[PDB]
User: Fold this.
Amino acid sequence: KLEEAEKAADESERGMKVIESRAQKDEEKMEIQEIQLKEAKHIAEDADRK
Amino acid sequence: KLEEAEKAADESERGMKVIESRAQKDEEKMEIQEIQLKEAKHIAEDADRK
Assistant:
């Protein structure tokens, strides 16, 4: 049961590492896409201002 | 150790679910900011075009 509970922790932790690494990749990509959106929008606003 | 391993199962699994929720929020924000980046770039393209 300790192996099952610890394995549930270890496997859910690996699950977590993959989806936390995914959250990190999605977070970095969303920040990049958000900064690029802010800039593409700021370019659009700058182009609208122009 | 089993109680702590079950608490770790809960924390690594709750972690995995909080991270899955965060990864989903960051994935949706990634997907929302890339779709809206493509739109913000098309607005920049339209803003530059107009």
Summary: The radius of gyration of chain B is 20 Å. Chain B touches chain A through 32 residues (CB under 8 Å).
